[PDB]
């Protein structure tokens, strides 16, 4: 799930982390009043959408630029009128754009210095780790490739928690001095407890910096949430804007189906995450272009199979289907009947390759060929891949 910028920074502000002051306008008038209410020497105005590169985007109203600067609250009003309601296209959105419903009206703070700081559950280390760099404002990866000596890491013991010495040391290594060291050490702490409270897999502050007046401020940040912990982050996951995902993915979600859209024309659905990724690869590997990854999960139902077929048969890109199911200890004849049932009810009109495996594959390969529907069976995963790739040209 993804938070809007205003949702994620409010989350941080409420937990002691310092961010730019801001308000959230639903209307051009709201943006004007907010700009007035800021006691800000300079205002920034930012379209609230999930995609990146909002900076150089375009609006149906004609406005170039999703993010704008001005000292004049009136300017905020005008520019907001050219955002709110209209649609923002970026190098991360379909040519349609995204409807902009809210804009952030924030104070713009000058940056004197820039560091990188993230808290992260590190698989290599078996616990939470602080990762900082005195070199901020650039992507962390390029920093590690060019100057690994400027990556500093502190492992935090998850029961003992973050100790003052750990925060002092990281602050020091990122080049904060004097009263800025105290602010930075304080803020590293508050960031870390924020990261445990909300069950984050990563909290990334870049730039983690200083204002000229002497203030440590997280100027921007990205939060990654553990999907597993949703049952105990009810209030946060409720903030999720499902309206910017591929709508197929959202409908799949409604049926415990794990779907992810690829740019291809051969649709596939499989029980098992890893086998679903393998089926994507083995399709491409035989020339093809897979339309999607879909994981039915462990259990195959006459009814879940229907919803999967319902999705794929509703996607305009899809010109073929490769189903590959391991029946395990269920009679694969009772799967192929779920498949012929759903394919007749859905009026299957694209060619479907089905690989089954498990008990009674013999009577199962028969129901599939005897179906009177555009269905052909396959002996193994190379067959299905090869046959499916042939079905389009």
């Amino acid at each position: 799930m993804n938070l809007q910028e205003y949702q994620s920074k409010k989350l941080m502000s409420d937990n002691g982390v310092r961010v730019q002051r801001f308000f959230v306008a639903d209307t051009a008038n709201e943006a004007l009043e907010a700009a007035k209410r800021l006691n800000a020497k300079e205002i920034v105005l930012k379209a609230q959408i999930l995609a990146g590169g909002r900076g150089k985007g375009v609006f149906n109203s004609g406005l170039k630029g999703g993010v704008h600067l001005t000292k004049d609250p009136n300017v905020v009003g005008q520019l907001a009128k050219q955002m709110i309601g209209y649609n923002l296209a970026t190098k991360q959105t379909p040519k349609e754009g995204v409807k902009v419903n809210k804009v952030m009206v924030a104070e713009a703070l000058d940056i004197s210095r820039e560091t990188y700081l993230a808290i992260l559950m590190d698989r290599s280390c078996n616990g939470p780790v602080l990762v900082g760099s005195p070199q901020g404002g650039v992507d962390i990866e390029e920093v590690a490739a060019s100057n690994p000596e400027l990556i500093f890491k502190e492992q935090i013991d998850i029961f003992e928690g973050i100790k003052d010495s750990q925060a002092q040391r990281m602050a020091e290594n990122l080049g904060f001095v004097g009263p800025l060291k105290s602010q930075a050490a304080d803020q590293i702490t508050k960031l870390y407890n924020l990261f445990l409270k909300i069950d984050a897999t990563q909290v990334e502050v870049n730039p983690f910096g200083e204002t000229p007046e002497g203030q440590v401020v997280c100027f921007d940040a990205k939060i990654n949430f553990d999907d597993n912990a949703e049952f105990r982050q009810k209030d946060i996951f409720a903030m999720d804007d499902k309206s910017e995902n591929e709508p197929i993915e959202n409908e799949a979600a409604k049926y415990d189906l794990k779907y992810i859209g690829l740019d291809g024309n051969i649709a596939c659905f499989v029980n098992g995450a890893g086998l679903a990724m393998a089926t994507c690869d083995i399709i491409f590997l035989n020339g093809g272009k897979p339309a999607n990854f879909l994981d039915l999960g462990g259990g195959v139902k006459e009814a879940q199979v229907y919803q999967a077929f319902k999705l794929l048969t509703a996607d305009p890109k899809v010109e073929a289907i490769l189903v590959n199911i391991f029946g395990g200890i269920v009679n694969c004849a009772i799967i192929a009947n779920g498949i012929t049932k759903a394919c007749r009810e859905l009026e299957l009109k694209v060619p479907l390759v089905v690989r089954l495996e498990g008990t009674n594959v013999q009577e199962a390969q028969k129901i599939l060929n005897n179906s009177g529907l555009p269905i052909t069976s396959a002996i193994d995963l190379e067959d299905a891949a090869k046959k499916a790739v042939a079905s389009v040209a």
Partner: protein
């Protein structure tokens, strides 16, 4: 260290099993199959149902009682995500030698806590969570894998994937090689057993003449296993290792079903895993449908070499 408990992966015909979540939908079902398979399932736990009888077997309130009353040496967990990490802890505390956690969805922070206590002892070996368990064909089966596709034999299989393991199993059964011990380490990013853990057992076991390592995107365990093979499976009398690494077409930034299967910040891609594996002597099967024929051909290549030089 915790590595001492690696031997407990090699479940066998004397393994005696209890089921945590025994009276639940999946505990019940896969217990019936454990009994169909001939596995020494001997009892189970459900808080608040100690005393009941289930599948002709006793139900206990705590792992500690179950261990005392039955002599159990291994535990399998079908406990729902909010409580499963607590179940794992109870079994570490109960000092159960081998614990298999089938549960998907345990919070990562939970598993960091579980791992914290796990790594600080050596009586208990954890496989999982989010895995299908371990099977010694014909001798002992802990988890959800279908028994009937297996056949006792010579290939060790370790794998982050459940359904992909079945492919490997079926293929190595189809080519006639059989499996010595399969271990599904599951698809979570924080878990109790990596590839290296299974390789040390495979390498030290004589029943295991070949290894298949099935991996996927995310983390660095494939890369670590590549290094390990360089130190422990070089020189002569080395065992062939065929691997398949899934997710070559996976888009970055996305969880590909498994919570642990995601490329982020450029780390965790499939092709980095193939290079690193291939640099240790590992034969990567391009196609997931060819694990069996590739490990098979690998044995042929060694036989052709012996015929050539005599």
């Amino acid at each position: 260290s915790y590595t001492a408990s690696r031997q407990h992966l090699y479940v066998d015909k004397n393994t005696k099993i209890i089921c945590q979540g025994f009276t639940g939908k999946q505990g019940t079902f896969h217990s019936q199959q454990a009994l169909e398979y001939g596995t020494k399932l001997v009892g189970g736990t459900t808080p608040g149902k100690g005393g009941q009888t289930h599948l002709g077997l006793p139900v206990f309130n705590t792992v500690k009682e179950a261990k005392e009353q039955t002599g159990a040496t291994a535990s399998v967990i079908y406990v729902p995500p909010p409580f499963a990490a607590a179940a794992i802890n109870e079994a570490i505390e109960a000092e159960i030698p081998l614990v298999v956690c089938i549960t998907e969805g345990i919070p990562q922070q939970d598993m960091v806590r579980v791992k914290h206590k796990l790594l600080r002892q050596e009586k208990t070996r954890l496989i999982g969570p989010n895995c299908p368990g371990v099977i010694n064909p014909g001798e002992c089966k802990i988890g959800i894998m279908p028994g009937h596709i297996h056949k006792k034999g010579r290939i060790g299989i370790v794998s982050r994937s459940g359904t992909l393991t079945y492919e490997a199993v079926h293929q190595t059964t189809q080519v006639g090689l059989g499996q010595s011990l399969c271990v599904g380490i599951g698809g979570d990013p924080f878990n109790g057993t990596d590839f290296i853990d299974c390789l040390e057992i495979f390498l030290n076991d004589s029943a295991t003449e070949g290894i298949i390592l099935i991996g996927e995107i995310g983390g660095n365990a494939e890369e670590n296993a590549a290094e390990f093979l360089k130190q422990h499976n070089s020189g002569p009398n080395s065992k062939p290792v065929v691997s398949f690494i899934a997710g070559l077409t996976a888009p970055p930034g996305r969880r590909m079903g498994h919570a642990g299967a995601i490329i982020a910040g450029g780390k965790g891609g499939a092709k980095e895993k193939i290079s690193a594996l291939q640099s240790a002597g590992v034969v990567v099967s391009m196609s997931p449908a060819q694990l069996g024929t590739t490990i098979y051909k690998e044995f042929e290549k060694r036989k052709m070499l012996e015929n050539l030089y005599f």
